[PDB]
Amino acid sequence: PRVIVVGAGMSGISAAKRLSEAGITDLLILEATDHIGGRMHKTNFAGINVELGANWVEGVNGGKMNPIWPIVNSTLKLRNFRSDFDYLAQNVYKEDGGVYDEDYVQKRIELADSVEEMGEKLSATLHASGRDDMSILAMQRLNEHQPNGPATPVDMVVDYYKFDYEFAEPPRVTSLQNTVPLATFSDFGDDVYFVADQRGYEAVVYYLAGQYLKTDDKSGKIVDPRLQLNKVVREIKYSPGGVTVKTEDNSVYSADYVMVSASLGVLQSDLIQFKPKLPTWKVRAIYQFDMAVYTKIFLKFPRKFWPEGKGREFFLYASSRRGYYGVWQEFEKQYPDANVLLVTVTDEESRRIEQQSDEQTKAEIMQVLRKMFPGKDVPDATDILVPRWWSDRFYKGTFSNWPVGVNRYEYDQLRAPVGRVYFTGEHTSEHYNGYVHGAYLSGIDSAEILINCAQKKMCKYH
Amino acid sequence: PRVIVVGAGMSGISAAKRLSEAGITDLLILEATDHIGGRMHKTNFAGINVELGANWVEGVNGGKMNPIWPIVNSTLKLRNFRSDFDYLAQNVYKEDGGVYDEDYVQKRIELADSVEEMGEKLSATLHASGRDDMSILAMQRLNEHQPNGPATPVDMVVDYYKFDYEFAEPPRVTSLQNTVPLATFSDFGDDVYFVADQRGYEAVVYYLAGQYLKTDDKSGKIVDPRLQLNKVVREIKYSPGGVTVKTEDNSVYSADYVMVSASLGVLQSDLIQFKPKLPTWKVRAIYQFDMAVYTKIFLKFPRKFWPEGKGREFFLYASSRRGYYGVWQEFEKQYPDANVLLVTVTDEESRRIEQQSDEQTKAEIMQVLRKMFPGKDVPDATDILVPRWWSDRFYKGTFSNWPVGVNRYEYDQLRAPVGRVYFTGEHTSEHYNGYVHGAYLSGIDSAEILINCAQKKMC
Ligand SMILES: Cc1cc2nc3c(=O)[nH]c(=O)nc-3n(C[C@H](O)[C@H](O)[C@H](O)COP(=O)(O)OP(=O)(O)OC[C@H]3O[C@@H](n4cnc5c(N)ncnc54)[C@H](O)[C@@H]3O)c2cc1C
Ligand SMILES: Cc1cc2nc3c(=O)[nH]c(=O)nc-3n(C[C@H](O)[C@H](O)[C@H](O)COP(=O)(O)OP(=O)(O)OC[C@H]3O[C@@H](n4cnc5c(N)ncnc54)[C@H](O)[C@@H]3O)c2cc1C
Ligand SMILES: *[C@@H]1O[C@H](CO)[C@@H](O[C@@H]2O[C@H](CO)[C@@H](O)[C@H](O)[C@H]2NC(C)=O)[C@H](O)[C@H]1NC(C)=O
Ligand SMILES: *[C@@H]1O[C@H](CO)[C@@H](O[C@@H]2O[C@H](CO)[C@@H](O)[C@H](O)[C@H]2NC(C)=O)[C@H](O)[C@H]1NC(C)=O
Ligand SMILES: NCCCCCCCCN
Ligand SMILES: NCCCCCCCCN
């Protein structure tokens, strides 16, 4: 059987790998960009390679092994470090300078954490159909007994840190049942490790690809003609007998099946035309799920003016404006002496920020930093990097988020195949949507459904 | 039977009137503040009385008569004017100076309207169980085929004026099924009339109350001992046989039933302790519904610097920060020669602003106005009025909003009594949650439910 796989990010490469393993080697992987890896991609910033996209292996040291971990930490030995968030309470800055008292902050953190745990108990009891789901916010109101969730500067940045910084959308839009607790942490462990290696977290993808695609002996570049880069799929025609795939440069290919791995945001943008049009139930499922945006703004300074040392890696800015330049990370271990800082924003702020100049964003950030470190001579950043994932047509966002309103059956419709057209990607992982490991596993899972149809003639889905 | 009614807002007075009409006159109305009317309430600003709460009769000129209209327009003849939003396209201000091209804006408005109309068609096909409901934002993504809803500044402000200015929360939190289309307008008509009368919109409540409570013949003031002001209820104890209600000043009262009319926000706050605790089904329904906040910030200036004239009443500021001081109104008709402007904010901005001083807010607004009118010499406002409804423990918000996730059945549980404890208020209105007419009809419906149970044993 010939199979065309659209996209060579983690899930596509992973799916193709599994097909190869089942003996399906008549493959053609069509990648839009000039490289593989997709949302795992590094870039040179001020002389160092930093990650524009995925940066952590999340879910480590628990009851089961996250499949990505051994590759990162053993097979490839990518340089990495465990993130420690235990000292946040000593690092929350006031809108107007200096940090809050540690004991005061630790108490708000403990309250927030208690509400969430009460939320995990409620969640376990909700009907599996998702019909009784509610937003994380409704659960917070219930447990704090207030007509609102966190609303003062400190509680709000603590809330953002706890939720938006992981999901990239506010608790009020997010499904309680599908995110509290989160299987990634429950199954694989509570720790996370930040990859900081010149080769990039994407090395994991190049490694998998190399297990089955041909590579150059001296350069080690993949040279297999089954992988074709710079091929943007613009149309997929499918019928009872097979499928035809057309790219922007006018190439046309045929196969028995096609596996689509493009992000949920690409699917929501109509970059790819399906003929016939996808069924209404499928379309509705595609539009109801959320494609979030998480913007890693890197900044480079001529000298350092922030604290370094124990518990200093992560710090928060308690703005009275929720989510305004709130979560900071300093790189004393990852990029020593580079004088770089990383502030993360998401959702509304990301969209605003992608739409204006980097210079304007840099000036907003400098006012924040000067308010946070009033006693220092804070020098203007000499370089800034604002990743624009929502604006990139091959991504249209950074990762999916399960909103309140999408139920279990609707989520399955999102993953379901349509005739000979199969879907894969992080947004198709039932328990790990959003993550690199969810992309990896979704590729194997989709490939298997295809293998059953193709090899065992078991073609019915659910 | 003796019935205690907690709160003298529209629904409380309305319920008590309906009960009195069924002959249940042994009533005791306990109100926390020193006056009746609740969310319908005026105040003096710049030597004129303006509305801090409700200000429009909404849904007029349609197939059914909005019960409040005749009272406002005929019975009391409160001074009022129909709002015309037809010229908004001529009045959308760029973040940094002047208005956008009118044709460009009119097309953006049309596109937004069209998407909402498709949303109305879709909403009609969803199942009554709510299993296929979605947020209004989800409907916008689906109808426009994009991974996001309105996102440029102009599109966002149009989006804000079309939804947040009515509901006080963003489309992404709002139930499509239960807000588009909205019964208020579908049933009563598309027009809305702004009340600008010195007696205040609250006069409607005073009129209803005087139909059954005693008033002084000279003054006209209510003097009936069945109404007691300054009574903050803090505890309601109930048993299969009756109830006891305790107030902050330490009074204690007994009755056969209690009708609670305090806002959903107050109920989500714990100001009132129930003993025993309300059942879980009740508690969950209470916390799942939303109590929104809509802040009317009034400003007075030494002289006018904004346009006046045809189509000038309403104007928008298209900030790149969604919802930042975005919806403006000027009162050339309402308060001629007063030099007052009104800017409205909601939700996140409302909670941030209630927490800062008036001066800080004034300063923020002066920067926006200066950006809006670069050609003028914009004087600083001499006075500002920032209503703090969310911070006020007797309201904790301005009006309910229906969030995605809650279905009709769970909404109905809000209305459900618990033993002898009955509930009323805008958040219990079957199809008009959030409005004055909804608070009004809710008091009547709640009272009839209690009448049938108490008087005919049909519960
Ligand atoms: C900023 C950011 C931060 C994140 N943080 C983390 C983190 O720390 N840890 C973690 O576990 N996860 C994180 N993630 C999520 C993680 O990166 C993704 O879950 C995963 O990489 C998605 O892989 P995928 O194969 O599902 O999608 P993709 O990587 O998007 O792969 C799809 C491929 O299809 C290509 N393509 C698109 N359209 C077409 C077309 N029409 N024709 C051909 N090719 C096409 C795209 O170029 C891409 O190569 C982050 C992602 C981002 C962007
Ligand atoms: C800023 C704002 C703008 C609005 N705009 C409009 C508009 O233009 N048009 C429209 O139709 N609707 C509008 N509304 C909505 C409308 O005002 C309300 O739906 C309606 O007045 C609510 O009446 P109610 O009786 O349900 O509640 P309320 O008016 O809240 O009455 C409840 C009463 O209970 C009292 N109370 C609270 N706690 C206690 C306690 N512990 N013990 C005793 N008494 C207590 C309160 O003081 C209050 O008097 C607006 C409201 C606000 C606040
Ligand atoms: C990550 O990988 C490193 C690489 O080995 C692990 O460190 C080794 O662990 C074994 C287990 O006892 C030791 O015998 C080696 O001495 C360790 N090497 C070093 C350099 O310390 C490490 O434990 C792995 N981390 C996780 C979280 O799995
Ligand atoms: C609101 O009330 C005014 C008060 O009458 C209405 O205006 C009158 O309507 C009658 C009906 O034919 C006319 O004969 C009078 O001449 C009108 N008075 C004025 C001053 O024009 C008005 O139409 C009402 N508005 C609504 C929406 O009901
Ligand atoms: N710290 C960044 C985490 C990014 C991974 C997406 C997961 C959220 C969706 N459940
Ligand atoms: N434009 C002001 C409207 C206030 C009334 C609240 C209704 C919103 C909930 N349906």
PDB file of N, CA and C in Angstrom, chain B residues 256-325:
ATOM      1  N   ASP B 256     -43.058  31.261  57.787  1.00  0.00           N
ATOM      2  CA  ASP B 256     -43.303  29.946  57.217  1.00  0.00           C
ATOM      3  C   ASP B 256     -42.418  29.695  55.996  1.00  0.00           C
ATOM      4  N   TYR B 257     -41.997  30.765  55.321  1.00  0.00           N
ATOM      5  CA  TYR B 257     -41.175  30.710  54.107  1.00  0.00           C
ATOM      6  C   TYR B 257     -40.270  31.916  53.952  1.00  0.00           C
ATOM      7  N   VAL B 258     -39.218  31.771  53.145  1.00  0.00           N
ATOM      8  CA  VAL B 258     -38.364  32.923  52.901  1.00  0.00           C
ATOM      9  C   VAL B 258     -38.151  32.916  51.389  1.00  0.00           C
ATOM     10  N   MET B 259     -38.154  34.108  50.799  1.00  0.00           N
ATOM     11  CA  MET B 259     -38.010  34.253  49.355  1.00  0.00           C
ATOM     12  C   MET B 259     -36.732  35.068  49.250  1.00  0.00           C
ATOM     13  N   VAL B 260     -35.692  34.447  48.710  1.00  0.00           N
ATOM     14  CA  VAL B 260     -34.412  35.136  48.612  1.00  0.00           C
ATOM     15  C   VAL B 260     -34.252  35.859  47.271  1.00  0.00           C
ATOM     16  N   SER B 261     -34.111  37.187  47.275  1.00  0.00           N
ATOM     17  CA  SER B 261     -33.945  37.909  46.009  1.00  0.00           C
ATOM     18  C   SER B 261     -32.551  38.527  45.796  1.00  0.00           C
ATOM     19  N   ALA B 262     -31.602  38.284  46.685  1.00  0.00           N
ATOM     20  CA  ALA B 262     -30.251  38.804  46.545  1.00  0.00           C
ATOM     21  C   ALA B 262     -29.618  38.287  45.241  1.00  0.00           C
ATOM     22  N   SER B 263     -28.672  39.022  44.653  1.00  0.00           N
ATOM     23  CA  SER B 263     -28.068  38.623  43.368  1.00  0.00           C
ATOM     24  C   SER B 263     -27.303  37.286  43.387  1.00  0.00           C
ATOM     25  N   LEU B 264     -27.112  36.716  42.198  1.00  0.00           N
ATOM     26  CA  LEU B 264     -26.323  35.501  42.096  1.00  0.00           C
ATOM     27  C   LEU B 264     -24.961  35.793  42.736  1.00  0.00           C
ATOM     28  N   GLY B 265     -24.408  36.988  42.531  1.00  0.00           N
ATOM     29  CA  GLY B 265     -23.099  37.272  43.137  1.00  0.00           C
ATOM     30  C   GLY B 265     -23.117  37.168  44.650  1.00  0.00           C
ATOM     31  N   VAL B 266     -24.189  37.691  45.239  1.00  0.00           N
ATOM     32  CA  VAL B 266     -24.284  37.622  46.693  1.00  0.00           C
ATOM     33  C   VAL B 266     -24.380  36.138  47.114  1.00  0.00           C
ATOM     34  N   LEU B 267     -25.156  35.374  46.362  1.00  0.00           N
ATOM     35  CA  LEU B 267     -25.262  33.980  46.745  1.00  0.00           C
ATOM     36  C   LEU B 267     -23.922  33.270  46.541  1.00  0.00           C
ATOM     37  N   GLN B 268     -23.093  33.678  45.594  1.00  0.00           N
ATOM     38  CA  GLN B 268     -21.820  32.980  45.417  1.00  0.00           C
ATOM     39  C   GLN B 268     -20.826  33.410  46.487  1.00  0.00           C
ATOM     40  N   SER B 269     -21.145  34.487  47.186  1.00  0.00           N
ATOM     41  CA  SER B 269     -20.215  34.988  48.186  1.00  0.00           C
ATOM     42  C   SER B 269     -20.345  34.460  49.605  1.00  0.00           C
ATOM     43  N   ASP B 270     -21.351  33.709  50.001  1.00  0.00           N
ATOM     44  CA  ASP B 270     -21.256  33.477  51.456  1.00  0.00           C
ATOM     45  C   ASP B 270     -21.649  34.610  52.415  1.00  0.00           C
ATOM     46  N   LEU B 271     -22.161  35.734  51.929  1.00  0.00           N
ATOM     47  CA  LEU B 271     -22.594  36.760  52.886  1.00  0.00           C
ATOM     48  C   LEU B 271     -23.738  36.099  53.700  1.00  0.00           C
ATOM     49  N   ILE B 272     -24.547  35.257  53.070  1.00  0.00           N
ATOM     50  CA  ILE B 272     -25.635  34.669  53.842  1.00  0.00           C
ATOM     51  C   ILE B 272     -25.363  33.220  54.169  1.00  0.00           C
ATOM     52  N   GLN B 273     -25.358  32.871  55.440  1.00  0.00           N
ATOM     53  CA  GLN B 273     -25.133  31.456  55.757  1.00  0.00           C
ATOM     54  C   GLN B 273     -26.428  30.651  55.806  1.00  0.00           C
ATOM     55  N   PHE B 274     -26.514  29.513  55.115  1.00  0.00           N
ATOM     56  CA  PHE B 274     -27.735  28.693  55.158  1.00  0.00           C
ATOM     57  C   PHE B 274     -27.436  27.569  56.138  1.00  0.00           C
ATOM     58  N   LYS B 275     -28.434  27.224  56.938  1.00  0.00           N
ATOM     59  CA  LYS B 275     -28.314  26.149  57.923  1.00  0.00           C
ATOM     60  C   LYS B 275     -29.627  25.352  57.986  1.00  0.00           C
ATOM     61  N   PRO B 276     -29.538  24.109  57.552  1.00  0.00           N
ATOM     62  CA  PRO B 276     -28.300  23.523  57.080  1.00  0.00           C
ATOM     63  C   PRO B 276     -27.824  24.066  55.737  1.00  0.00           C
ATOM     64  N   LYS B 277     -26.626  23.644  55.352  1.00  0.00           N
ATOM     65  CA  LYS B 277     -26.028  24.063  54.089  1.00  0.00           C
ATOM     66  C   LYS B 277     -26.917  23.676  52.934  1.00  0.00           C
ATOM     67  N   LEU B 278     -26.908  24.467  51.870  1.00  0.00           N
ATOM     68  CA  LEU B 278     -27.752  24.129  50.731  1.00  0.00           C
ATOM     69  C   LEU B 278     -27.221  22.807  50.174  1.00  0.00           C
ATOM     70  N   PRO B 279     -28.072  22.019  49.532  1.00  0.00           N
ATOM     71  CA  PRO B 279     -27.594  20.745  48.994  1.00  0.00           C
ATOM     72  C   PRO B 279     -26.599  20.984  47.858  1.00  0.00           C
ATOM     73  N   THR B 280     -25.795  19.959  47.595  1.00  0.00           N
ATOM     74  CA  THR B 280     -24.767  20.019  46.551  1.00  0.00           C
ATOM     75  C   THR B 280     -25.282  20.399  45.178  1.00  0.00           C
ATOM     76  N   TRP B 281     -26.434  19.843  44.787  1.00  0.00           N
ATOM     77  CA  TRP B 281     -26.958  20.199  43.468  1.00  0.00           C
ATOM     78  C   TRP B 281     -27.229  21.683  43.351  1.00  0.00           C
ATOM     79  N   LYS B 282     -27.643  22.255  44.476  1.00  0.00           N
ATOM     80  CA  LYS B 282     -27.964  23.676  44.494  1.00  0.00           C
ATOM     81  C   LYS B 282     -26.684  24.506  44.426  1.00  0.00           C
ATOM     82  N   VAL B 283     -25.748  24.112  45.277  1.00  0.00           N
ATOM     83  CA  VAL B 283     -24.455  24.785  45.313  1.00  0.00           C
ATOM     84  C   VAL B 283     -23.731  24.727  43.955  1.00  0.00           C
ATOM     85  N   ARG B 284     -23.787  23.577  43.299  1.00  0.00           N
ATOM     86  CA  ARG B 284     -23.121  23.545  42.013  1.00  0.00           C
ATOM     87  C   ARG B 284     -23.761  24.419  40.966  1.00  0.00           C
ATOM     88  N   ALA B 285     -25.082  24.431  40.959  1.00  0.00           N
ATOM     89  CA  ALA B 285     -25.730  25.277  39.976  1.00  0.00           C
ATOM     90  C   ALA B 285     -25.373  26.727  40.292  1.00  0.00           C
ATOM     91  N   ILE B 286     -25.320  27.090  41.570  1.00  0.00           N
ATOM     92  CA  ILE B 286     -25.016  28.481  41.849  1.00  0.00           C
ATOM     93  C   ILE B 286     -23.640  28.899  41.340  1.00  0.00           C
ATOM     94  N   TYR B 287     -22.649  28.064  41.600  1.00  0.00           N
ATOM     95  CA  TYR B 287     -21.297  28.442  41.202  1.00  0.00           C
ATOM     96  C   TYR B 287     -20.954  28.302  39.728  1.00  0.00           C
ATOM     97  N   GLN B 288     -21.731  27.499  39.010  1.00  0.00           N
ATOM     98  CA  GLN B 288     -21.490  27.374  37.587  1.00  0.00           C
ATOM     99  C   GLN B 288     -21.977  28.541  36.736  1.00  0.00           C
ATOM    100  N   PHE B 289     -22.990  29.266  37.198  1.00  0.00           N
ATOM    101  CA  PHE B 289     -23.504  30.417  36.419  1.00  0.00           C
ATOM    102  C   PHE B 289     -22.598  31.630  36.675  1.00  0.00           C
ATOM    103  N   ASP B 290     -22.573  32.627  35.787  1.00  0.00           N
ATOM    104  CA  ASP B 290     -21.640  33.739  35.968  1.00  0.00           C
ATOM    105  C   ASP B 290     -22.337  35.003  36.455  1.00  0.00           C
ATOM    106  N   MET B 291     -21.711  35.747  37.356  1.00  0.00           N
ATOM    107  CA  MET B 291     -22.244  37.049  37.757  1.00  0.00           C
ATOM    108  C   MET B 291     -21.243  38.023  37.070  1.00  0.00           C
ATOM    109  N   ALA B 292     -21.657  38.733  36.023  1.00  0.00           N
ATOM    110  CA  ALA B 292     -20.779  39.662  35.309  1.00  0.00           C
ATOM    111  C   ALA B 292     -20.760  41.020  36.015  1.00  0.00           C
ATOM    112  N   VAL B 293     -19.893  41.918  35.547  1.00  0.00           N
ATOM    113  CA  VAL B 293     -19.728  43.281  36.082  1.00  0.00           C
ATOM    114  C   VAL B 293     -19.595  44.255  34.899  1.00  0.00           C
ATOM    115  N   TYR B 294     -20.369  45.336  34.928  1.00  0.00           N
ATOM    116  CA  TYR B 294     -20.420  46.330  33.849  1.00  0.00           C
ATOM    117  C   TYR B 294     -20.277  47.660  34.560  1.00  0.00           C
ATOM    118  N   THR B 295     -19.188  48.382  34.304  1.00  0.00           N
ATOM    119  CA  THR B 295     -18.938  49.625  35.019  1.00  0.00           C
ATOM    120  C   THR B 295     -19.133  50.880  34.183  1.00  0.00           C
ATOM    121  N   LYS B 296     -20.056  51.735  34.613  1.00  0.00           N
ATOM    122  CA  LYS B 296     -20.397  52.959  33.890  1.00  0.00           C
ATOM    123  C   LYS B 296     -19.555  54.078  34.486  1.00  0.00           C
ATOM    124  N   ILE B 297     -18.474  54.470  33.812  1.00  0.00           N
ATOM    125  CA  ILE B 297     -17.609  55.515  34.370  1.00  0.00           C
ATOM    126  C   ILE B 297     -18.012  56.877  33.801  1.00  0.00           C
ATOM    127  N   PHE B 298     -18.548  57.732  34.671  1.00  0.00           N
ATOM    128  CA  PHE B 298     -18.973  59.072  34.239  1.00  0.00           C
ATOM    129  C   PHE B 298     -17.857  60.101  34.425  1.00  0.00           C
ATOM    130  N   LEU B 299     -17.831  61.044  33.486  1.00  0.00           N
ATOM    131  CA  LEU B 299     -16.781  62.053  33.540  1.00  0.00           C
ATOM    132  C   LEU B 299     -17.406  63.391  33.183  1.00  0.00           C
ATOM    133  N   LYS B 300     -16.993  64.424  33.921  1.00  0.00           N
ATOM    134  CA  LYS B 300     -17.460  65.796  33.673  1.00  0.00           C
ATOM    135  C   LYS B 300     -16.285  66.701  33.279  1.00  0.00           C
ATOM    136  N   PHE B 301     -16.482  67.508  32.236  1.00  0.00           N
ATOM    137  CA  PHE B 301     -15.425  68.393  31.757  1.00  0.00           C
ATOM    138  C   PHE B 301     -15.870  69.854  31.739  1.00  0.00           C
ATOM    139  N   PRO B 302     -14.871  70.727  31.821  1.00  0.00           N
ATOM    140  CA  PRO B 302     -15.047  72.178  31.814  1.00  0.00           C
ATOM    141  C   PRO B 302     -15.533  72.648  30.454  1.00  0.00           C
ATOM    142  N   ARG B 303     -15.350  71.857  29.397  1.00  0.00           N
ATOM    143  CA  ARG B 303     -15.862  72.241  28.086  1.00  0.00           C
ATOM    144  C   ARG B 303     -15.855  71.050  27.142  1.00  0.00           C
ATOM    145  N   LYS B 304     -16.673  71.071  26.104  1.00  0.00           N
ATOM    146  CA  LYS B 304     -16.809  69.949  25.177  1.00  0.00           C
ATOM    147  C   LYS B 304     -15.667  69.924  24.177  1.00  0.00           C
ATOM    148  N   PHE B 305     -15.263  68.749  23.723  1.00  0.00           N
ATOM    149  CA  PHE B 305     -14.202  68.721  22.724  1.00  0.00           C
ATOM    150  C   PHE B 305     -14.480  67.559  21.794  1.00  0.00           C
ATOM    151  N   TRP B 306     -15.628  66.924  21.982  1.00  0.00           N
ATOM    152  CA  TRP B 306     -15.966  65.813  21.116  1.00  0.00           C
ATOM    153  C   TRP B 306     -17.096  66.253  20.219  1.00  0.00           C
ATOM    154  N   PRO B 307     -17.299  65.502  19.154  1.00  0.00           N
ATOM    155  CA  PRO B 307     -18.358  65.835  18.218  1.00  0.00           C
ATOM    156  C   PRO B 307     -19.762  65.689  18.789  1.00  0.00           C
ATOM    157  N   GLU B 308     -20.670  66.526  18.304  1.00  0.00           N
ATOM    158  CA  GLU B 308     -22.070  66.423  18.692  1.00  0.00           C
ATOM    159  C   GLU B 308     -22.851  66.503  17.398  1.00  0.00           C
ATOM    160  N   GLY B 309     -24.035  65.908  17.342  1.00  0.00           N
ATOM    161  CA  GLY B 309     -24.731  65.975  16.076  1.00  0.00           C
ATOM    162  C   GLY B 309     -25.293  64.627  15.697  1.00  0.00           C
ATOM    163  N   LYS B 310     -25.803  64.556  14.474  1.00  0.00           N
ATOM    164  CA  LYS B 310     -26.407  63.334  13.993  1.00  0.00           C
ATOM    165  C   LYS B 310     -25.430  62.166  14.036  1.00  0.00           C
ATOM    166  N   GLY B 311     -25.868  61.090  14.672  1.00  0.00           N
ATOM    167  CA  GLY B 311     -25.073  59.876  14.745  1.00  0.00           C
ATOM    168  C   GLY B 311     -23.914  59.966  15.721  1.00  0.00           C
ATOM    169  N   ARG B 312     -23.749  61.084  16.424  1.00  0.00           N
ATOM    170  CA  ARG B 312     -22.620  61.210  17.343  1.00  0.00           C
ATOM    171  C   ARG B 312     -22.775  60.631  18.746  1.00  0.00           C
ATOM    172  N   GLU B 313     -23.964  60.187  19.121  1.00  0.00           N
ATOM    173  CA  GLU B 313     -24.160  59.737  20.511  1.00  0.00           C
ATOM    174  C   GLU B 313     -23.223  58.642  21.036  1.00  0.00           C
ATOM    175  N   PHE B 314     -23.004  57.640  20.186  1.00  0.00           N
ATOM    176  CA  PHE B 314     -22.155  56.507  20.555  1.00  0.00           C
ATOM    177  C   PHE B 314     -20.887  56.466  19.732  1.00  0.00           C
ATOM    178  N   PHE B 315     -19.759  56.194  20.383  1.00  0.00           N
ATOM    179  CA  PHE B 315     -18.496  56.092  19.657  1.00  0.00           C
ATOM    180  C   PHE B 315     -17.588  55.074  20.331  1.00  0.00           C
ATOM    181  N   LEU B 316     -16.710  54.448  19.547  1.00  0.00           N
ATOM    182  CA  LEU B 316     -15.811  53.392  20.039  1.00  0.00           C
ATOM    183  C   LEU B 316     -14.355  53.808  19.918  1.00  0.00           C
ATOM    184  N   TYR B 317     -13.540  53.278  20.824  1.00  0.00           N
ATOM    185  CA  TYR B 317     -12.103  53.527  20.745  1.00  0.00           C
ATOM    186  C   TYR B 317     -11.490  52.166  20.422  1.00  0.00           C
ATOM    187  N   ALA B 318     -10.844  52.042  19.269  1.00  0.00           N
ATOM    188  CA  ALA B 318     -10.243  50.762  18.899  1.00  0.00           C
ATOM    189  C   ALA B 318      -8.837  50.525  19.450  1.00  0.00           C
ATOM    190  N   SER B 319      -8.736  50.237  20.736  1.00  0.00           N
ATOM    191  CA  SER B 319      -7.422  49.971  21.337  1.00  0.00           C
ATOM    192  C   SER B 319      -6.875  48.612  20.892  1.00  0.00           C
ATOM    193  N   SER B 320      -5.555  48.471  20.855  1.00  0.00           N
ATOM    194  CA  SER B 320      -4.952  47.176  20.516  1.00  0.00           C
ATOM    195  C   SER B 320      -5.076  46.242  21.720  1.00  0.00           C
ATOM    196  N   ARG B 321      -5.494  46.786  22.862  1.00  0.00           N
ATOM    197  CA  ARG B 321      -5.745  46.013  24.085  1.00  0.00           C
ATOM    198  C   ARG B 321      -7.269  45.799  24.150  1.00  0.00           C
ATOM    199  N   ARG B 322      -7.736  44.605  23.844  1.00  0.00           N
ATOM    200  CA  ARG B 322      -9.185  44.400  23.787  1.00  0.00           C
ATOM    201  C   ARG B 322      -9.957  44.933  24.974  1.00  0.00           C
ATOM    202  N   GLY B 323     -11.057  45.666  24.809  1.00  0.00           N
ATOM    203  CA  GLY B 323     -11.859  46.104  25.967  1.00  0.00           C
ATOM    204  C   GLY B 323     -11.321  47.258  26.787  1.00  0.00           C
ATOM    205  N   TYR B 324     -10.242  47.896  26.337  1.00  0.00           N
ATOM    206  CA  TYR B 324      -9.693  49.027  27.112  1.00  0.00           C
ATOM    207  C   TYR B 324     -10.457  50.316  26.774  1.00  0.00           C
ATOM    208  N   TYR B 325     -11.203  50.859  27.735  1.00  0.00           N
ATOM    209  CA  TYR B 325     -12.028  52.066  27.554  1.00  0.00           C
ATOM    210  C   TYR B 325     -12.596  52.154  26.134  1.00  0.00           C
TER     211      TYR B 325
END
